[PDB]
Amino acid sequence: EKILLNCGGGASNLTDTDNRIWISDVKSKFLSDSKTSPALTQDPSVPEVPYMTARVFRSPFTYTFPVASGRKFVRLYFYPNSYDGLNATNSLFSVSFGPYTLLKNFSASQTAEALTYAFIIKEFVVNVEGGTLNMTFTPESAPSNAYAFVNGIEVTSMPDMYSSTMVTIDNSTALENVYRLNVGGNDISPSADTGLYRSWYDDQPYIFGAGLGIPETADPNMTIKYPTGTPTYVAPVDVYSTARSMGPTAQINLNYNLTWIFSIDSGFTYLVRLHFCEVSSNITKINQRVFTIYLNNQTAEPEADVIAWTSSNGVPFHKDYVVNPPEGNGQQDLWLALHPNPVNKPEYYDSLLNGVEIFKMNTSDGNLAGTNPIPG
């Protein structure tokens, strides 16, 4: 159950580099006057679908989607560029879904340059109470000729997966997914996900130190055995089948932290889901691999031990933590770090992580919009 809307598309269907079919919005029943435009310049790193066309808004504009009630992935696709004669500099706008502000004075141009991406996918988890999802694009008034645009819109059905421990999430809290990592493994494209069209990304660009540890992969004879009550779609087999650990030398592992850093917007509470699965055949018992998990240099799990959590090799497991980052304005770094805990003299001195998902949670105002990041 999904809608892949290629805003400003041509008449005929186009498939992207992941074998997904996108439909044009040009005469669709989702429009509620805007202009259509190819992007002026091309980037070889940017797919053609849906990024080489946009719909351009010089005044407020609402898409309406007939949907079943329930929770939704809403994913918005932006390739900053010149559209309809207007340079990417002049694009500043807001996006509202009912009570929630998803974007506010959003600059795709400045956000892309800060993060060194050529294009932007914004992912939101929202609950639609009724039979329609309305999303309103509103150019800022502040620059006199400011405009809004969008390259594509995706709406996907989902179970209630990410709901309810600081270092309640429910029907009324919207999320923005800011990160999703397959730790120790490869990228997973949306169509290789478990039916939720989530992108998982290799974790290596986020490792802080020179301490990259080592990748580990499940043996081919090992099955990933989700327990009854943990849905198999919580994360793909390839997330749990791969992991990063610290290395084979105990003395080295005692002297560094396996560390990942994530740029986040200040002023929000963050949900961090950590995924685990003991992938080494050499590890089957309690007190063989025991480690401490630090979030933002604070103890979050004193003695994580995946066999004590899962009872057995090759069993997928996850745990959620909420982080309240320090008082701030702009962007700051969120620190995740693993370190062996030798106090109970485990057999090895090592740590383990298989995946991570990080979500911004909305403030009480219904806001999810942060500031635009500043380039280096």
JSON list of N, CA, C and O in Angstrom, two decimals, residues 150-172:
[
{"chain": "A", "resi": 150, "resn": "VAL", "atom": "N", "xyz": [9.03, 20.75, -4.88]},
{"chain": "A", "resi": 150, "resn": "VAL", "atom": "CA", "xyz": [9.20, 19.35, -4.47]},
{"chain": "A", "resi": 150, "resn": "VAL", "atom": "C", "xyz": [9.42, 18.53, -5.74]},
{"chain": "A", "resi": 150, "resn": "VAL", "atom": "O", "xyz": [8.81, 18.80, -6.78]},
{"chain": "A", "resi": 151, "resn": "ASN", "atom": "N", "xyz": [10.31, 17.56, -5.66]},
{"chain": "A", "resi": 151, "resn": "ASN", "atom": "CA", "xyz": [10.60, 16.65, -6.75]},
{"chain": "A", "resi": 151, "resn": "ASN", "atom": "C", "xyz": [9.77, 15.39, -6.74]},
{"chain": "A", "resi": 151, "resn": "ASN", "atom": "O", "xyz": [9.47, 14.86, -7.74]},
{"chain": "A", "resi": 152, "resn": "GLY", "atom": "N", "xyz": [9.49, 14.88, -5.56]},
{"chain": "A", "resi": 152, "resn": "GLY", "atom": "CA", "xyz": [8.67, 13.72, -5.39]},
{"chain": "A", "resi": 152, "resn": "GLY", "atom": "C", "xyz": [8.12, 13.57, -4.00]},
{"chain": "A", "resi": 152, "resn": "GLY", "atom": "O", "xyz": [8.67, 14.06, -3.06]},
{"chain": "A", "resi": 153, "resn": "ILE", "atom": "N", "xyz": [7.00, 12.90, -3.89]},
{"chain": "A", "resi": 153, "resn": "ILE", "atom": "CA", "xyz": [6.36, 12.63, -2.62]},
{"chain": "A", "resi": 153, "resn": "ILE", "atom": "C", "xyz": [6.01, 11.16, -2.52]},
{"chain": "A", "resi": 153, "resn": "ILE", "atom": "O", "xyz": [5.47, 10.57, -3.42]},
{"chain": "A", "resi": 154, "resn": "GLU", "atom": "N", "xyz": [6.34, 10.56, -1.40]},
{"chain": "A", "resi": 154, "resn": "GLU", "atom": "CA", "xyz": [6.03, 9.19, -1.15]},
{"chain": "A", "resi": 154, "resn": "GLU", "atom": "C", "xyz": [5.18, 9.04, 0.09]},
{"chain": "A", "resi": 154, "resn": "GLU", "atom": "O", "xyz": [5.41, 9.70, 1.06]},
{"chain": "A", "resi": 155, "resn": "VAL", "atom": "N", "xyz": [4.12, 8.26, 0.01]},
{"chain": "A", "resi": 155, "resn": "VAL", "atom": "CA", "xyz": [3.31, 7.95, 1.17]},
{"chain": "A", "resi": 155, "resn": "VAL", "atom": "C", "xyz": [3.15, 6.45, 1.26]},
{"chain": "A", "resi": 155, "resn": "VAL", "atom": "O", "xyz": [2.55, 5.85, 0.42]},
{"chain": "A", "resi": 156, "resn": "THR", "atom": "N", "xyz": [3.64, 5.87, 2.35]},
{"chain": "A", "resi": 156, "resn": "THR", "atom": "CA", "xyz": [3.63, 4.44, 2.57]},
{"chain": "A", "resi": 156, "resn": "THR", "atom": "C", "xyz": [2.99, 4.03, 3.89]},
{"chain": "A", "resi": 156, "resn": "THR", "atom": "O", "xyz": [3.26, 4.60, 4.92]},
{"chain": "A", "resi": 157, "resn": "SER", "atom": "N", "xyz": [2.15, 3.03, 3.85]},
{"chain": "A", "resi": 157, "resn": "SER", "atom": "CA", "xyz": [1.51, 2.50, 5.03]},
{"chain": "A", "resi": 157, "resn": "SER", "atom": "C", "xyz": [2.49, 1.78, 5.92]},
{"chain": "A", "resi": 157, "resn": "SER", "atom": "O", "xyz": [3.42, 1.19, 5.46]},
{"chain": "A", "resi": 158, "resn": "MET", "atom": "N", "xyz": [2.27, 1.82, 7.20]},
{"chain": "A", "resi": 158, "resn": "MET", "atom": "CA", "xyz": [3.17, 1.10, 8.07]},
{"chain": "A", "resi": 158, "resn": "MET", "atom": "C", "xyz": [2.41, 0.63, 9.29]},
{"chain": "A", "resi": 158, "resn": "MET", "atom": "O", "xyz": [1.36, 1.20, 9.63]},
{"chain": "A", "resi": 159, "resn": "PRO", "atom": "N", "xyz": [2.88, -0.42, 9.96]},
{"chain": "A", "resi": 159, "resn": "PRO", "atom": "CA", "xyz": [2.37, -0.74, 11.30]},
{"chain": "A", "resi": 159, "resn": "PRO", "atom": "C", "xyz": [2.78, 0.32, 12.31]},
{"chain": "A", "resi": 159, "resn": "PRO", "atom": "O", "xyz": [3.57, 1.22, 12.02]},
{"chain": "A", "resi": 160, "resn": "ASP", "atom": "N", "xyz": [2.25, 0.20, 13.52]},
{"chain": "A", "resi": 160, "resn": "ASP", "atom": "CA", "xyz": [2.71, 1.03, 14.63]},
{"chain": "A", "resi": 160, "resn": "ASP", "atom": "C", "xyz": [3.94, 0.36, 15.23]},
{"chain": "A", "resi": 160, "resn": "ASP", "atom": "O", "xyz": [3.84, -0.49, 16.11]},
{"chain": "A", "resi": 161, "resn": "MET", "atom": "N", "xyz": [5.11, 0.77, 14.74]},
{"chain": "A", "resi": 161, "resn": "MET", "atom": "CA", "xyz": [6.38, 0.10, 15.03]},
{"chain": "A", "resi": 161, "resn": "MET", "atom": "C", "xyz": [7.24, 0.82, 16.05]},
{"chain": "A", "resi": 161, "resn": "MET", "atom": "O", "xyz": [8.03, 0.18, 16.76]},
{"chain": "A", "resi": 162, "resn": "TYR", "atom": "N", "xyz": [7.18, 2.15, 16.06]},
{"chain": "A", "resi": 162, "resn": "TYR", "atom": "CA", "xyz": [8.17, 2.97, 16.76]},
{"chain": "A", "resi": 162, "resn": "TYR", "atom": "C", "xyz": [7.56, 3.68, 17.97]},
{"chain": "A", "resi": 162, "resn": "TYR", "atom": "O", "xyz": [7.98, 4.79, 18.31]},
{"chain": "A", "resi": 163, "resn": "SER", "atom": "N", "xyz": [6.60, 3.05, 18.64]},
{"chain": "A", "resi": 163, "resn": "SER", "atom": "CA", "xyz": [5.86, 3.69, 19.72]},
{"chain": "A", "resi": 163, "resn": "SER", "atom": "C", "xyz": [6.17, 3.05, 21.08]},
{"chain": "A", "resi": 163, "resn": "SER", "atom": "O", "xyz": [6.85, 2.02, 21.17]},
{"chain": "A", "resi": 164, "resn": "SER", "atom": "N", "xyz": [5.67, 3.69, 22.13]},
{"chain": "A", "resi": 164, "resn": "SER", "atom": "CA", "xyz": [5.85, 3.23, 23.51]},
{"chain": "A", "resi": 164, "resn": "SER", "atom": "C", "xyz": [4.74, 2.28, 23.94]},
{"chain": "A", "resi": 164, "resn": "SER", "atom": "O", "xyz": [4.05, 2.54, 24.93]},
{"chain": "A", "resi": 165, "resn": "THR", "atom": "N", "xyz": [12.52, 6.41, 29.83]},
{"chain": "A", "resi": 165, "resn": "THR", "atom": "CA", "xyz": [13.77, 5.73, 29.49]},
{"chain": "A", "resi": 165, "resn": "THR", "atom": "C", "xyz": [14.73, 6.75, 28.87]},
{"chain": "A", "resi": 165, "resn": "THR", "atom": "O", "xyz": [15.40, 6.48, 27.86]},
{"chain": "A", "resi": 166, "resn": "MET", "atom": "N", "xyz": [14.76, 7.92, 29.49]},
{"chain": "A", "resi": 166, "resn": "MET", "atom": "CA", "xyz": [15.68, 8.98, 29.08]},
{"chain": "A", "resi": 166, "resn": "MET", "atom": "C", "xyz": [17.07, 8.70, 29.65]},
{"chain": "A", "resi": 166, "resn": "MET", "atom": "O", "xyz": [17.24, 7.93, 30.60]},
{"chain": "A", "resi": 167, "resn": "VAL", "atom": "N", "xyz": [18.07, 9.34, 29.05]},
{"chain": "A", "resi": 167, "resn": "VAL", "atom": "CA", "xyz": [19.45, 9.15, 29.44]},
{"chain": "A", "resi": 167, "resn": "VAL", "atom": "C", "xyz": [19.96, 10.38, 30.19]},
{"chain": "A", "resi": 167, "resn": "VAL", "atom": "O", "xyz": [20.36, 10.28, 31.36]},
{"chain": "A", "resi": 168, "resn": "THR", "atom": "N", "xyz": [6.93, 8.69, 26.72]},
{"chain": "A", "resi": 168, "resn": "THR", "atom": "CA", "xyz": [5.78, 8.18, 25.99]},
{"chain": "A", "resi": 168, "resn": "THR", "atom": "C", "xyz": [5.69, 8.63, 24.53]},
{"chain": "A", "resi": 168, "resn": "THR", "atom": "O", "xyz": [5.68, 9.80, 24.23]},
{"chain": "A", "resi": 169, "resn": "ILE", "atom": "N", "xyz": [5.63, 7.67, 23.62]},
{"chain": "A", "resi": 169, "resn": "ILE", "atom": "CA", "xyz": [5.52, 7.97, 22.21]},
{"chain": "A", "resi": 169, "resn": "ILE", "atom": "C", "xyz": [4.26, 7.31, 21.74]},
{"chain": "A", "resi": 169, "resn": "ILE", "atom": "O", "xyz": [4.13, 6.11, 21.84]},
{"chain": "A", "resi": 170, "resn": "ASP", "atom": "N", "xyz": [3.37, 8.07, 21.14]},
{"chain": "A", "resi": 170, "resn": "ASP", "atom": "CA", "xyz": [2.10, 7.51, 20.73]},
{"chain": "A", "resi": 170, "resn": "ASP", "atom": "C", "xyz": [1.40, 8.17, 19.56]},
{"chain": "A", "resi": 170, "resn": "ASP", "atom": "O", "xyz": [2.00, 8.86, 18.79]},
{"chain": "A", "resi": 171, "resn": "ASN", "atom": "N", "xyz": [0.14, 7.83, 19.40]},
{"chain": "A", "resi": 171, "resn": "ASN", "atom": "CA", "xyz": [-0.72, 8.37, 18.38]},
{"chain": "A", "resi": 171, "resn": "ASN", "atom": "C", "xyz": [-0.56, 9.84, 18.05]},
{"chain": "A", "resi": 171, "resn": "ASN", "atom": "O", "xyz": [-0.91, 10.27, 16.98]},
{"chain": "A", "resi": 172, "resn": "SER", "atom": "N", "xyz": [-0.06, 10.63, 18.97]},
{"chain": "A", "resi": 172, "resn": "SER", "atom": "CA", "xyz": [0.01, 12.06, 18.71]},
{"chain": "A", "resi": 172, "resn": "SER", "atom": "C", "xyz": [1.42, 12.59, 18.48]},
{"chain": "A", "resi": 172, "resn": "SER", "atom": "O", "xyz": [1.57, 13.79, 18.21]}
]
